[PDB]
């Protein structure tokens, strides 16, 4: 009991020249009243110093180390938006966790999340994620937000049949074939994809195969083509008598998956050399 207040005061005294005093006050109130909710939102905390706490609010801080949360096995809801958390293996034993929010954290390695197969909602919007392989194990998710990342391979999502809300806008998605089986979807977002092809040699008669495919595998007909190019399936064609550094084309197609209807929109950019 006394060791808890001692550790909290020692943590507060180590604040750099951050509202650690308010954090200590809230910790004392939660420990005294045996509260199940701990709200430490927007305290600028750069570090961290309760068996009944089930919801932990930590949005709006500067946390990089989440080791002090490793033994909070009663946690059901954990919010860590706008932090700087990069390692997630510290949550491997939070087997009661149902909801997890890690938006605006700049995270690229989400492999540790393979240790939370019971998760029901997962928010990873606005990060640096490319590989979502381990997400294939989270077969109990009904909400998954992956918007504003660098994801190009969404095949790991093909078996997550329980999904009802899926946010995939602002990524590098060009192939929706992996989503064809998610017939339980209610909300789906797929707009503003940015696809970058490998650089190819410039030609006066430039021919670029279209690679944008819908959920049926059919090529998406481009909506706009730069440099007066045209489309004759499967090829986008340009006449470039003078060299230019890049061409591009923008696509926009309505897609229906389950009970969800979404605009699959984006832009493919083709760099040219020589």
Numbering used by the authors: 8 to 24, 28 to 59, 64 to 288
The paper states:
Several viral immune evasion mechanisms have hampered the development of an effective vaccine against HCV, among them the remarkable conformational flexibility within neutralization epitopes in the HCV antigens. Here, we report the design of epitope-focused immunogens displaying two distinct HCV cross-neutralization epitopes. To address these limitations, we generated epitope-focused immunogens based on two antigenic regions including one on HCV E1 (residues 314 to 324) and one on HCV E2 (epitope I). Here, we have demonstrated that small thermally stable protein scaffolds that accurately mimic the structure and specific conformation of two HCV neutralization epitopes in complex with a human bnAb can induce nAbs in the context of a murine and a human antibody repertoire.
Epitope I (residues 412 to 423) is a prime example of such a structural flexibility, as epitope peptides comprising this segment have been crystallized in complex with nAb fragments in three distinct conformations. This suggests that the conformation of this amino acid segment follows an “induced-fit” binding mode to the antibody, and this conformational flexibility could explain the limited immunogenicity to the epitope I observed in patients with HCV. The steric clashes are caused by a variation in the angle of approach of the two Fabs to the epitope, which differs by 22° between HCV1 and AP33 (51). Together with the low thermostability profile of E2_S3 variants, a scaffold size that might hinder the assembly of multivalent NPs for immunization and the apparent limited antibody binding of E2_S3 variants, these results identified E1_S1 and E2_S2_1 as the most promising immunogen candidates.
